[PDB]
Design a protein around this ligand. Structure first.
Ligand SMILES: Cc1ccc(S[C@@H]2O[C@H](CO)[C@H](O)[C@H](n3cc(-c4ccc(F)c(C)c4)nn3)[C@H]2O)cc1
Ligand SMILES: [Cl-]
Length: 138
């Protein structure tokens, strides 16, 4: 398995039609996972499954600019499961990141950070065994 937290460079930044695929297995009794598409110190797109936020499972998405988190976007569809293998696919579209988990569409996140070419790394962290992290053009 790859060492978590893992940094996946995205050479030249992201572009529409770029597909990022992450395979891993959630740890037993997981608490949290995060994907962080980063523009330097800023987080263009934070995708954060929370397994126990006041006894609810929720995905929180947000952007961090100059160390400040913005408005959260929340999704109660929660496709992750402690102990089980998952696939996350993040497709960059012109106006949003489009996320599918286990081949089912989950959410879209409109681009707040609009310099897509400057979003040139992806951090993967939290309560997973990480099998692979890669990208391709579709
Ligand atoms: C005013 C204010 C008060 C409280 C908060 S809470 C904050 O909410 C953000 C989304 O709005 C992020 O989720 C933040 N966050 C989560 C993680 C994280 C996730 C998974 C992981 F596996 C690792 C290693 C780290 N890192 N930062 C989280 O602290 C926010 C604003
Ligand atoms: Cl969290």
């Amino acid at each position: 398995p790859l060492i978590v937290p893992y940094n996946l460079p995205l050479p030249g930044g992201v572009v529409p039609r770029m597909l990022i695929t992450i395979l891993g297995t959630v740890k037993p009794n997981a608490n949290r996972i995060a994907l962080d598409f980063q523009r330097g110190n800023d987080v263009a797109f934070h995708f954060n499954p929370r397994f126990n936020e006041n006894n609810r499972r929720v995905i929180v998405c947000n952007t961090k600019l100059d160390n400040n988190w913005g408005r959260e976007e929340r999704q109660s569809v929660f496709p992750f499961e402690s102990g089980k293998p998952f696939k996350i696919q993040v497709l960059v579209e012109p106006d949003h990141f489009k996320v599918a988990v286990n081949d089912a569409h989950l959410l879209q996140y409109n681009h707040r950070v609009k310099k897509l070419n400057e979003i040139s790394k992806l951090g993967i962290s939290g309560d997973i065994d990480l099998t692979s992290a890669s990208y391709t053009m579709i």
